Amino acid sequence: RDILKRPVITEKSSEAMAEDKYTFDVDTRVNKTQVKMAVEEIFNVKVASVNIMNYKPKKKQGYTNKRRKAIVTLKEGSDDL
Amino acid sequence: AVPKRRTSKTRKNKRRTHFKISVPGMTECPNCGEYKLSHRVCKNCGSYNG
Amino acid sequence: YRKLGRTSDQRKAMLRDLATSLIISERIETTEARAKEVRSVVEKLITLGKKGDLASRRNAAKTLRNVEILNEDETTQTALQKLFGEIAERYTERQGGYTRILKQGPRRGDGAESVIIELV
Amino acid sequence: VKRTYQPNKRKHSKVHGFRKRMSTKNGRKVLARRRRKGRKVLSA
Amino acid sequence: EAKAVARTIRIAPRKVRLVLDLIRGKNAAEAIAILKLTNKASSPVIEKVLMSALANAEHNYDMNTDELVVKEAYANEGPTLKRFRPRAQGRASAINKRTSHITIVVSDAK
RNA sequence: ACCGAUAGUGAACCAGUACCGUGAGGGAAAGGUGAAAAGCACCCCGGAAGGGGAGUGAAAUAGAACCUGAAACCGUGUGCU
RNA sequence: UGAGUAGCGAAAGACGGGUGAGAAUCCCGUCCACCGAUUGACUAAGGUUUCCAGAGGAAGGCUCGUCCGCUCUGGGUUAGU
Structure with a gap:
């Protein structure tokens, strides 16, 4: 469903970890069980593992928004976006 | 300890009479052509010829 | 007869370090107050190296420092081996006056007048 | 020496927190005064 | 006569005036050597x-x-x-960082 | 027959905000280029900052630390002493 | 005004290369010196991006600064135990 917001494109994500792991930006109210079902339905893949982590607002006078990025490991299939 | 009276301009300018800066000892270098401190080494060329 | 704003224990180590750095490089920069005292300290180490006796080779080891010079590469002759060797064979006929001081003017940030000391 | 203020995250919310000012009529009159004045922070 | 101005320098005026007396009224060739071999913080500027x-x-x-x-x-x-600057027993003492305006005028006397 | 930026509401500016206190509370300073941005293309010294020309405009001793610019205070030159 | 006066917060540094407009203070190397029931190695409270990389020197750093816990841009925290 509409739980994925933005793919992450960085040296840590794109140059490395991109062999089999894909990083995304998810809603701030979803668990790792809802990210596995959403990825398969949209990308037609089979997910093997899913890690998640939280990020706090950063002062920039005002603060940037908080983020939540998850990393999914697929057993079979490739996104190749 | 503390000053009883403030200092006036007339008195302040007389004390600073000898508070001057010195003019260095400089001469024209035989080979460089620029000015040089006596008994030193020409910065421009590097020759002393003692 | 100078103290150089240091204690007796530091005024001896700094002199041992300045004498060894010169024998290796043959030309160094320092202040004027340090150059006029290191002058007499280095001129006596060459006097010992011109006698050649083993007794003199052991008295020079009390002031010299253990430092290798790879430039020569012939076993990386120690600082003490350079003396009694390359340096002892140059001033054979010269009796005194193995150094020369040169002025350069004050240095920025400190006001101290830099000097150049080298072996003649 | 030891100074008067030693920070403590939990003790600061239990004594001056929002939920403790609402448990008392006098505490509620504190938030009504800060609201009437236009403060950006009400409690804590 | 030509003029040049250096505005808002971070050197105290009293310190800049000490070197301005050594060049006022000299020649444009002997004033550069004086400013170079001098060892004051206002010479390069x-x-x-x-x-x-x-x-x-x-x-x-x-x-x-x-x-x-x-x-x-x-x-x-x-x-x-x-x-x-903080002082002893909770006191504070003000400190001033002054700036200077330097002006130079060269002429040929004609 | 009220005030005109130390005045008038604490606040003419994004003010119950900078800041101060464990807390209940206490609390400021800050308006003005020009009719029109037409906000100095280009050359020169300099690492920059800054400056000297050129140009814009009625005016740049109107160049954003920008209407008018008093006194204290700090400098340079000079007639008499 | 006092006045270019007091002070600049416990302590060992020296030289040779490199960078650059500018080096006693930044980088690399070799000697020397200090702690070592410890100035070493892990972790609660508290702080809340001070962490990493490239690029900067107006202000802050009681001097300097090419450097920084300072400025700009982009990054960094993965648990069935």
Whole structure:
């Protein structure tokens, strides 16, 4: 469903970890069980593992928004976006 | 300890009479052509010829 | 007869370090107050190296420092081996006056007048 | 020496927190005064 | 006569005026050597203002450097920066960082 | 027959906000280029900052630390002493 | 005004290369010196991006600064135990 917001494109994500792991930006109210079902339905893949982590607002006078990025490991299939 | 009276301009300018800066000892270098401190080494060329 | 704003224990180590750095490089920069005292300290180490006796080779080891010079590469002759060797064979006929001081003017940030000391 | 203020995250919310000012009529009159004045922070 | 101004320098005016007396009224060739071999913190800054005034004399106008003399040289006070240093027993003492305005005038006396 | 930026509401500015206190509370300073941005293309000194020309405009001793610019205070030159 | 006066917060540094407009203070190397029931190695409270890389020197750093816990841009925290 509409739980994925933005793919992450960085040296840590794109140059490395991109062999089999894909990083995304998810809603701030979803668990790792809802990210596995959403990825398969949209990308037609089979997910093997899913890690998640939280990020706090950063002062920039005002603060940037908080983020939540998850990393999914697929057993079979490739996104190749 | 503390000053009883403030200092006036007339008195302040007389004390600073000898508070001057010195003019260095400089001469024209035989080979460089620029000015040089006596008994030193020409910065421009590097020759002393003692 | 100078103290150089240091204690007796530091005024001896700094002199041992300045004498060894010169024998290796043959030309160094320092202040004027340090150059006029290191002058007499280095001129006596060459006097010992011109006698050649083993007794003199052991008295020079009390002031010299253990430092290798790879430039020569012939076993990386120690600082003490350079003396009694390359340096002892140059001033054979010269009796005194193995150094020369040169002025350069004050240095920025400190006001101290830099000097150049080298072996003649 | 030891100074008067030693920070403590939990003790600061239990004594001056929002939920403790609402448990008392006098505490509620504190938030009504800060609201009437236009403060950006009400409690804590 | 050509002029050059260096505005809002971070050196105290009293310290800049000490070197301005050594060059006021001298020649444009002997004033550069004096400023160089001197060992004051205001020499490099004052020298860069005199080099831009001699360049203005031959580019905007056309005057040969051989006929250039230091006519006027003075320094004025600029805005100050108010800073505070902590003292003993909870006291504070104000500190001033003063600025200067350097002006140089070269002329050929003709 | 009220005030005109130390005045008038604490606040003509994004003010119950900078800041101060464990807390209940206490609390400021800050308006003005020009009729029109037409906000100095380009050359020169400099690492920059800054400055001297050129140009815009009625005016740049109107160049954003920008209407008018008093006194204290700090400098340079000079007639008499 | 006092006044270019007091002070600049416990302590060992020296030289040779490199960078650059500018080096006693930044980088690399070799000697020397200090702690070692410890100035070493892990972790609660508290702080809340001070962490990493490239690029900067107006202000802050009681001097300097090419450097920084300072400025700009982009990054960094993965648990069935």
